[PDB]
Amino acid sequence: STAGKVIKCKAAVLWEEKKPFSIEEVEVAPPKAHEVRIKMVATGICRSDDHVVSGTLVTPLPVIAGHEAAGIVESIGEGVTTVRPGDKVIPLFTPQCGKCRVCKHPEGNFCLKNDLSMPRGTMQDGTSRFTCRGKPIHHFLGTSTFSQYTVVDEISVAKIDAASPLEKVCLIGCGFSTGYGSAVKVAKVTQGSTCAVFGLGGVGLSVIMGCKAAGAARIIGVDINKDKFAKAKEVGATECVNPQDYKKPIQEVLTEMSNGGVDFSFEVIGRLDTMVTALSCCQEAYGVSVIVGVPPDSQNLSMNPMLLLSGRTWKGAIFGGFKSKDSVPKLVADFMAKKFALDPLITHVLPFEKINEGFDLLRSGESIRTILTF
Amino acid sequence: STAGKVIKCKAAVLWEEKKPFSIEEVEVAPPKAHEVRIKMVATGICRSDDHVVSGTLVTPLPVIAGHEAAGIVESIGEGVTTVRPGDKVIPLFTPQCGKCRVCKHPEGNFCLKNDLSMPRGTMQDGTSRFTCRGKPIHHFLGTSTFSQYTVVDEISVAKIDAASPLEKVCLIGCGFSTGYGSAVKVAKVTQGSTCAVFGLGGVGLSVIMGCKAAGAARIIGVDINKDKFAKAKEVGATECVNPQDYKKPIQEVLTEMSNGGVDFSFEVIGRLDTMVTALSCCQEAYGVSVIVGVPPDSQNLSMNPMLLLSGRTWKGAIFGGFKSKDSVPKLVADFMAKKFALDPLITHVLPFEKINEGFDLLRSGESIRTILTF
Ligand SMILES: NC(=O)C1=CN([C@@H]2O[C@H](COP(=O)(O)OP(=O)(O)OC[C@H]3O[C@@H](n4cnc5c(N)ncnc54)[C@H](O)[C@@H]3O)[C@@H](O)[C@H]2O)C=CC1
Ligand SMILES: NC(=O)C1=CN([C@@H]2O[C@H](COP(=O)(O)OP(=O)(O)OC[C@H]3O[C@@H](n4cnc5c(N)ncnc54)[C@H](O)[C@@H]3O)[C@@H](O)[C@H]2O)C=CC1
Ligand SMILES: O=CNC1CCCCC1
Ligand SMILES: O=CNC1CCCCC1
Numbered sequence: 134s135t136a137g138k139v140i141k142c143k144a145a146v147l148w149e150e151k152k153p154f155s156i157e158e159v160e161v162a163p164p165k166a167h168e169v170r171i172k173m174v175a176t177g178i179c180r181s182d183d184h185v186v187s188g189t190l191v192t193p194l195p196v197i198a199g200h201e202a203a204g205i206v207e208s209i210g211e212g213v214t215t216v217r218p219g220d221k222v223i224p225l226f227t228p229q230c231g232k233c234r235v236c237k238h239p240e241g242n243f244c245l246k247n248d249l250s251m252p253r254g255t256m257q258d259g260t261s262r263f264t265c266r267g268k269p270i271h272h273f274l275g276t277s278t279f280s281q282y283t284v285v286d287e288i289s290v291a292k293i294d295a296a297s298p299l300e301k302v303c304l305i306g307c308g309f310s311t312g313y314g315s316a317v318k319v320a321k322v323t324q325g326s327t328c329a330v331f332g333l334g335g336v337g338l339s340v341i342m343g344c345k346a347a348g349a350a351r352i353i354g355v356d357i358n359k360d361k362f363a364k365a366k367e368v369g370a371t372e373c374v375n376p377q378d379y380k381k382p383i384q385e386v387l388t389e390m391s392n393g394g395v396d397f398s399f400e401v402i403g404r405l406d407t408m409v410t411a412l413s414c415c416q417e418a419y420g421v422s423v424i425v426g427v428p429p430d431s432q433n434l435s436m437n438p439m440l441l442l443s444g445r446t447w448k449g450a451i452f453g454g455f456k457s458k459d460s461v462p463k464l465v466a467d468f469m470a471k472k473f474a475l476d477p478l479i480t481h482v483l484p485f486e487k488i489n490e491g492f493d494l495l496r497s498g499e500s501i502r503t504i505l506t507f
Numbered sequence: 508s509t510a511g512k513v514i515k516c517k518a519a520v521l522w523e524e525k526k527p528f529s530i531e532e533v534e535v536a537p538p539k540a541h542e543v544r545i546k547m548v549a550t551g552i553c554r555s556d557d558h559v560v561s562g563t564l565v566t567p568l569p570v571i572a573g574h575e576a577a578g579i580v581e582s583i584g585e586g587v588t589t590v591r592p593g594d595k596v597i598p599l600f601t602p603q604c605g606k607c608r609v610c611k612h613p614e615g616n617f618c619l620k621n622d623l624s625m626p627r628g629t630m631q632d633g634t635s636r637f638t639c640r641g642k643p644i645h646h647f648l649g650t651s652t653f654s655q656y657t658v659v660d661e662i663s664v665a666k667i668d669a670a671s672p673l674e675k676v677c678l679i680g681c682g683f684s685t686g687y688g689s690a691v692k693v694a695k696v697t698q699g700s701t702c703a704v705f706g707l708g709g710v711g712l713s714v715i716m717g718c719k720a721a722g723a724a725r726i727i728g729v730d731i732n733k734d735k736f737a738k739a740k741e742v743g744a745t746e747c748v749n750p751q752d753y754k755k756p757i758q759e760v761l762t763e764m765s766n767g768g769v770d771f772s773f774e775v776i777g778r779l780d781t782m783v784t785a786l787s788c789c790q791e792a793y794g795v796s797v798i799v800g801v802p803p804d805s806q807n808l809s810m811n812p813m814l815l816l817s818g819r820t821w822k823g824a825i826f827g828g829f830k831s832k833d834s835v836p837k838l839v840a841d842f843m844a845k846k847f848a849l850d851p852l853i854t855h856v857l858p859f860e861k862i863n864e865g866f867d868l869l870r871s872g873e874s875i876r877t878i879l880t881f
């Protein structure tokens with residue numbers, strides 16, 4: 134009943150920074166060639182979405198944010214071959230065009246068609262499918278999931294198992310996959326190893342999940358909020374430390390705890406100081422540190438390159454290093470096959486209309502992931 | 508005739524920074540338990556030794572520097588089992604104790620007994636074997652090869668082929684192995700890849716050799732001194748670029764030349780800016796950059812962590828990542844079997860007494876490696 138026609142629906146619009154989201158009616162255009170229009174079913178609140186509100190992350194405003202989600206295809210544009218109406222899907226914030234150098238590389242996932250490096254906030258063709266009170270509204274990472282309906286490019290969507298629990302697997306859209314893959318794929322955590330994880334939110338908990346799956350012997354969680362320790366230990370942490378409890382810098386503490394430094398470290402917060410600290414706490418000759426957290430826009434860190442000269446490996450990744458379109462369906466299948474759990478990450482479930490409350494929860498430290506249901 | 512007796516010989520003493528070395532008589536004590544006294548045959552002039560003079564590399568003064576060398580064992584102390592008098596040997600600036608956690612790790616090489624991290628300028632026991640004008644003189648990285656005789660700890664010396672040409676294989680003690688290993692072992696350059704090498708001195712040329720051995724398709728040499736291009740090409744560079752020849756930053760140039768960034772980049776100079784430039788020029792999603800150059804003492808670099816977040820891997824290494832005592836004999840055997848060449852690095856030969864002229868040659872940009880003969 135809506136194919137080919139503009140849909141008027143409810144979405145959460147962010148008109149400017151540091152304001153609450155505005156719940157109102159937007160118009161969503163029909164998909165054009167190689168485009169897919171999706172009816173949202175569930176969406177998670179990730180810290181990345183909050184970064185747009187706080188100014189940590191810069192992307193054109195006004196925008197319909199949201200990128201961790203799942204839904205059902207309402208309609209497809211001409212030339213689409215990978216999904217069909219009625220299919221359960223997950224929008225991919227990192228696309229997989231399959232044609233670029235990165236997509237063709239065995240170890241690359243940061244497809245050149247991404248909207249991250251040089252944020253435009255549109256569709257692949259340079260325009261937007263969203264309007265609110267007569268104004269054009271920007272897209273976010275080619276996803277825009279805080280809406281009852283969205284339109285995405287074909288390369289930014291994956292078809293998933295028809296029997297999937299959308300209220301759970303939306304987390305495969307960002308948080309879980311990012312953390313899990315950062316450990317198992319990017320760091321390539323080894324059996325018997327010692328790991329340190331900075332940040333115990335949804336993404337950090339997922340990193341822990343990965344470290345445990347990889348066979349780590351010790352997994353030290355680090356967070357200034359002690360309230361996040363019980364959940365970390367439930368999912369695999371062997372020890373948790375709060376930097377504020379110590380008189381000395383935490384890198385020193387961790388080095389002592391690990392009898393000379395950890396094998397693998399992970400920055401899952403988004404702070405410059407913690408990125409340097411995490412590098413420092415890994416063993417000087419063979420240690421590996423992975424940056425996951427997003428830094429505040431345009432800001433540079435300062436470090437001594439002797440930390441690397443001795444032998445350390447420092448790397449970062451988007452979406453856990455997973456080639457998005459290939460991996461997402463695979464991950465959903467693994468979850469259906471009980472290979473990992475998602476429930477430990479879900480602390481709150483709210484209706485979409487309560488998005489602001491959901492963000493309040495995140496900002497207060499009370500939640501891990503709030504799932505919004507449409 | 509000299510066993511168990513103090514040896515009086517000539518050495519090049521550095522009394523203070525930024526002055527010429529003083530060639531004069533020193534007193535070399537006999538080796539203590541697990542110590543080896545070596546009659547030096549040949550030693551190379553590496554930039555790192557110049558860094559001691561310039562204050563770029565901080566180690567206690569007065570000192571007998573020099574660390575890329577080869578000689579013959581004069582005597583051994585009690586308990587030495589790995590070398591015997593008359594053996595040809597190469598001193599190891601990076602030790603291999605074989606007992607620490609790093610030595611036991613499959614990838615690690617920066618043995619915890621090293622004198623680089625917290626320089627003491629002594630033997631393993633905290634004392635010196637050198638006296639000059641009645642004053643104790645410091646050791647350098649446990650080697651001190653700018654002397655007719657030196658004393659080194661057993662874990663800092665390797666026995667090599669009795670037939671080795673010491674005037675050539677002394678380079679396996681530093682320069683060649685560092686560069687070669689940085690490409691083949693640390694970066695693990697792949698067949699068909701595009702590489703960029705910043706710095707075309709002895710070490711950078713060795714990096715090029717390694718890249719070529721590894722099968723790289725393109726090897727782009729970068730240096731502000733064009734006079735260093737011909738030899739770079741000889742050893743394998745496919746292209747050479749002088750950053751001063753351009754209006755753009757060389758990272759932009761290199762990115763354009765490589766159609767999106769290089770596979771592998773190497774910083775083989777020792778500047779904070781080029782370490783960042785080198786990182787920036789490798790592919791944002793799958794690129795790898797290796798720091799080999801030594802940065803000015805206690806200086807911090809500035810960089811945007813988004814360079815890592817996209818997928819880059821940044822790492823550094825000492826001595827090309829080679830476990831020193833295991834690797835050095837092998838490298839010599841390979842050299843003997845013509846697996847790599849050393850002659851392209853040797854531009855000048857001088858007698859030890861002309862150490863200062865050798866340093867002048869390095870500083871003037873005229874030489875690659877000057878080999879000093881005793
Ligand atoms: N690389 C990627 O592809 C992705 C990056 N991210 C980034 O990962 C980070 C984490 O995301 P979420 O788990 O959703 O965030 P979150 O806010 O739920 O978790 C962050 C945790 O860090 C802790 N923390 C804050 N300051 C700290 C400090 N100084 N020391 C120690 N702990 C501290 C907080 O208490 C909190 O538990 C964010 O920066 C997010 O933007 C998110 C997903 C994708
Ligand atoms: N990591 C390790 O184990 C080792 C590190 N090193 C370090 O490696 C570096 C290279 O050593 P060598 O080859 O002996 O030195 P070198 O001085 O012969 O070569 C350095 C080259 O860099 C070039 N250069 C200088 N400034 C430049 C700029 N702005 N842009 C481009 N090129 C520039 C010079 O013209 C020169 O050709 C030194 O810093 C040295 O201390 C050396 C040995 C072992
Ligand atoms: O959280 C989802 N995506 C993130 C990935 C890292 C850069 C900011 C956006
Ligand atoms: O050049 C030989 N050794 C170097 C290794 C890197 C730190 C300074 C000393």
Ligand SMILES: [Zn+2]
Pocket residue numbers: 228229230231232233234235236244245246
């Ligand atoms: Zn692509």
Ligand SMILES: [Zn+2]
Pocket residue numbers: 179180181182200201307308
């Ligand atoms: Zn996210």
Ligand SMILES: [Zn+2]
Pocket residue numbers: 602603604605606607608609610618619620
């Ligand atoms: Zn050791």
Ligand SMILES: [Zn+2]
Pocket residue numbers: 553554555556574575681682
């Ligand atoms: Zn050297």
